[PDB]
Symmetry: D2
Subunit: 220 residues, 4 copies
Amino acid sequence: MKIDILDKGFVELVDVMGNDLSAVRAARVSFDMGLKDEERDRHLIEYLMKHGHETPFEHIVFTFHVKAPIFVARQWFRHRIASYNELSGRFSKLSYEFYIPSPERLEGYKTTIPPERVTEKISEIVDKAYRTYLELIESGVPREVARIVLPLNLYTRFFWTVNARSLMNFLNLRADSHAQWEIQQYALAIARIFKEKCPWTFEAFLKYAYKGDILKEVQV
Amino acid sequence: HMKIDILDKGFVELVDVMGNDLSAVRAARVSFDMGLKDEERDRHLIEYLMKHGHETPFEHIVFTFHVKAPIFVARQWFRHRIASYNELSGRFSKLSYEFYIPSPERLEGYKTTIPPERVTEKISEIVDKAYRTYLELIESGVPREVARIVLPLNLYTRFFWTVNARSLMNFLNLRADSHAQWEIQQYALAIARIFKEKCPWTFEAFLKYAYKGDILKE
Amino acid sequence: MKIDILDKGFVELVDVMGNDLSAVRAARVSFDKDEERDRHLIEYLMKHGHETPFEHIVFTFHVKAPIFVARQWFRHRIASYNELSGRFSKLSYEFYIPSPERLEGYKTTIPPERVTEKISEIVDKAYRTYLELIESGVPREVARIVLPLNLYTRFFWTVNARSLMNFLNLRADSHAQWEIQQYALAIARIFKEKCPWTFEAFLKYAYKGDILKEVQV
Amino acid sequence: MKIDILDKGFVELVDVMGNDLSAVRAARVSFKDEERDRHLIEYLMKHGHETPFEHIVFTFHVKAPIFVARQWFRHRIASYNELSGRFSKLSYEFYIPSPERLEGYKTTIPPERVTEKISEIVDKAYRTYLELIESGVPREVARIVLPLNLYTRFFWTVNARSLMNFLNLRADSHAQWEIQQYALAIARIFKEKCPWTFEAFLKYAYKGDILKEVQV
Ligand SMILES: Cc1cc2c(cc1C)N(C[C@H](O)[C@H](O)[C@H](O)COP(=O)(O)OP(=O)(O)OC[C@H]1O[C@@H](n3cnc4c(N)ncnc43)[C@H](O)[C@@H]1O)c1[nH]c(=O)[nH]c(=O)c1N2
Ligand SMILES: Cc1cc2c(cc1C)N(C[C@H](O)[C@H](O)[C@H](O)COP(=O)(O)OP(=O)(O)OC[C@H]1O[C@@H](n3cnc4c(N)ncnc43)[C@H](O)[C@@H]1O)c1[nH]c(=O)[nH]c(=O)c1N2
Ligand SMILES: Cc1cc2c(cc1C)N(C[C@H](O)[C@H](O)[C@H](O)COP(=O)(O)OP(=O)(O)OC[C@H]1O[C@@H](n3cnc4c(N)ncnc43)[C@H](O)[C@@H]1O)c1[nH]c(=O)[nH]c(=O)c1N2
Ligand SMILES: Cc1cc2c(cc1C)N(C[C@H](O)[C@H](O)[C@H](O)COP(=O)(O)OP(=O)(O)OC[C@H]1O[C@@H](n3cnc4c(N)ncnc43)[C@H](O)[C@@H]1O)c1[nH]c(=O)[nH]c(=O)c1N2
């Protein structure tokens, strides 16, 4: 499962532990019970979501592999209840790719110059910063110093291990119109993979707990 | 599937696991824009991360256990906050008996004025009285959440424990050690055994370079 | 600030870092604007779900509570705890004995006074068995396992206002056990005294429980 | 207490809850004898009883380049509130390394030229950003051309146990020189507020190198 985001980004599912029944099993230990049948198990997921019983959902875990601009990674990495491993800016080899917004990214905004010129101006400063970085590297400046001139739209990569409860909090905050459009796009991809692996939890989440707007207006 | 019996009626059972040693190799190699390599280089990387303190790659390995343990042991266990728990509700569940009765051997090395067999019998006796008092209160309409407060700390509970390998290794450092209570040491030995089966390279490197306790090496 | 709970328990404030203005400063990101504008900002953050500024307000409490209550409390992982050791600490060997009023509303086969007496009686027998084991040379870590769940323990609880408000949402509520709801009312009272604007805005916009809106705190 | 770091950065202490005695009281579960209390701090540090140190909490106000903040914000057992790149007003200041930052490196051009080339690209990126903003481009889009050396500001609330983990990892020669400088300032403030815990930490638990070679 890999979903392309923006001009060069992606969200890829690396691994997953459990499914909707993992939350059913974790919740049923409360009354000294285990699993039952599909209809009763789906009814239990809805019940847990409708009444705020969130801890059973922590037993479902995902590992994603994400390629995203640093300005998006910075917002994402604010979610502390998760595990991260990212490309090292000090020692890693990079692809040196950058997010260049298309003119449509500026639709709705009254700009003094055409949106096409905004796209061109961003490519131009990206090209100059990248060339300056290459000149510094070629002259023996260490990468940890030379890379500080690179713009915030430079692409990075990281592994993200997160349980369904923390993933639903991430979706509440990022799959929402108050979040930056670029991270909303990534949150739609995370929601799509979550829905495929945990359909009952995802449907119950949208029905009872989801506080955002875009997941109820856009089919994922 | 993997199940280890602990104490007289307890157990530790493996419910699920995400990943293996290569999950930590993959997570660490993203730093240099690399992925997996060959068996020898990958095992060498696990030992390198362990000995130099690069712990975050081990968070991408996750386990779910199903545990049955006495409440005095669960109270110590539940202090490990970097993990997920779901436990039996004493407020809303039928009490299916089950208490940890130490065997006479638990008192070996202690000079007691009564035989250790009598200690075992005295513990079974007070457990039986507390349990029947609890049943009498329940039968008379006292809610479970009030009636259960008379039950002793050796009553068995059950719980699901979801924990990543980094937090699991912190748990082993603290509990798979002679300073921890013998009863939780037994449970930590079962946790270590299952971890070793699923992540042999991480477990071997952990014992060799990072493990601070004593009993796993004995 | 100390508030008595149950028959022998308490919640006592040990220390506090910050007040309502600590959340205002964190939200504006400035170590340096008008009481009305600052109170308006607290209500704005509470009403729109901007929770992280409230993490910069921290409390330390000293709690004396029965073990069954402490087990429920210690499920709140986003906090710091230090508790009396069951293996090595000296204990007062006090126990929570519910008063007959705890059984009001329940149709019991025996008078609620008899339930109170039966609980004190099994507590006394368990305590005497524990003493017999200790006197015979059984270590405390083994002998104490016969003690009932109503035995009082003590702990330090260091928690920030965001995690404290999650605790109030879950424990200052009729679905939580009455015994922990009493402790959560005391925590709410101390929180209100130290952070009146955050507490008032919390009740008005974010609080999901019932009892803090029905009982004067 | 405010300490200047780099060319335009700083670490400032906003608030603190407790001192060494907060860990002593937490360990004993009790709410004064200097020698016995200091002996207890060393005992806990030496035997790995870390949880009593969580009852000491600090709030700092930090101004640091984004490349340093990204490394810092990897410490999840802490609270942060940062300037919003999407909506906040900014000073628009940037870390320009001085020629001394390139000491020991064999460069094909003088280290002074590296400093000049960095100031030059920063100035061009900043001017491009201003041109976009002036033409109506939202800040959340225009800001993506700004370099990683742009200074951000944040509040950091962290307990002493997590702060000691941060010092173990960042007040060390394997960490990037820039974040080592900030970790030295944090160590200095921590030492002033918790002298016994800081000294016991260096003696028994500290795994880094620079705090045992440099007086803070
Ligand atoms: C639209 C928008 C706009 C902004 C921001 C977010 C969004 C969605 N943020 C980021 C925000 O403050 C926060 O850092 C992230 O949304 C992460 O949210 P959580 O803390 O809920 O997730 P996280 O994954 O960190 O934690 C998950 C849950 O665990 C709990 N938790 C974790 N750590 C805790 C702690 N130490 N104390 C208490 N509870 C804790 C909480 O219950 C939380 O919901 C922000 N930030 C900023 O600094 N300045 C800004 O201007 C903005 N702007
Ligand atoms: C010199 C150097 C070099 C690098 C890095 C760090 C340093 C010091 N890092 C960053 C590193 O992976 C890590 O994110 C930070 O050092 C934060 O460290 P902690 O997780 O210990 O602190 P943090 O404050 O996040 O946690 C504190 C403690 O809580 C525990 N903990 C917190 N959350 C946990 C969780 N979910 N599960 C288990 N335990 C948890 C651990 O005990 C930890 O010590 C890195 N990163 C990277 O991605 N790529 C890189 O190349 C590098 N390079
Ligand atoms: C009325 C009632 C009834 C019950 C229970 C609670 C209540 C209020 N519980 C306890 C419940 O499952 C939970 O352990 C506590 O209420 C603690 O709540 P939080 O996890 O929200 O707080 P906590 O302080 O642990 O966490 C604060 C916040 O951080 C986040 N968080 C922290 N750690 C996280 C993690 N690892 N992953 C994801 N997010 C994380 C969440 O956002 C959370 O709200 C329960 N329990 C049970 O096992 N069986 C039962 O029968 C019951 N019954
Ligand atoms: C032999 C023995 C004896 C005792 C105890 C333990 C052991 C092993 N304890 C329990 C002890 O205080 C602690 O609660 C547990 O060992 C859990 O340890 P961690 O915090 O390491 O794990 P946990 O799983 O909670 O955390 C994992 C890691 O995350 C980090 N971490 C998590 N939350 C954090 C926070 N809020 N701030 C900073 N870092 C955080 C740390 O790096 C920690 O190593 C104790 N307790 C007690 O109160 N009284 C006692 O007498 C004893 N006795």
